[PDB]
Curated annotation (Swiss-Prot):
The gene is TNNC1. This is Troponin C, slow skeletal and cardiac muscles. It comes from the Eukaryota. The chain holds residues 2 to 91 of 161 of the full protein. Ca(2+) 1 binds at D65, D67, S69, T71, E76. One of its GO terms (molecular function) is protein homodimerization activity.
Length: 129
């Protein structure tokens, strides 16, 4: 399954890792957590040659993020770098900024999903898109 990606980060050496280590500086643009949300995730991608959308990106970010805090951890970025470098046929959709679902996924809050009521999470459905 995803043993090629998860193991990828393990294949990287102190030097190879330094490539992405310093990259964060340009990605997060200087942060204490050293993480990047779906919004910024698009700015870092467009640099790799692919300028996808924040709505389509949040899809993988929500799955890659166990806590689904709405951001990407330093380690989470690695697995994405190996999984993306393989499937670069999904890079398209420039001139984008924010998306209803893009930011929504962040407001959802993995912890909020069960904050009030769960049955009230799939009660009102009108095409999420």
């Amino acid at each position: 399954g995803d043993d090629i990606y998860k193991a990828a980060v393990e294949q990287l050496t102190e030097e190879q890792k330094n490539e992405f280590k310093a990259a964060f500086d340009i990605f997060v643009l200087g942060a204490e957590d050293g993480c990047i949300s779906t919004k910024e995730l698009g700015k870092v991608m467009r640099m790799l040659g692919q300028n996808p959308t924040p709505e389509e990106l949040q899809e993988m970010i929500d799955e890659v993020d166990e806590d689904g805090s709405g951001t990407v951890d330093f380690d989470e970025f690695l697995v994405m770098m190996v999984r993306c470098m393989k499937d670069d046929s999904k890079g398209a959709g420039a001139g984008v900024r924010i998306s209803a679902d893009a930011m929504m996924q962040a407001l959802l809050g993995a912890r909020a999903k069960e904050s009030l009521d769960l049955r009230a999470h799939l009660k009102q459905v009108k095409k999420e898109d």
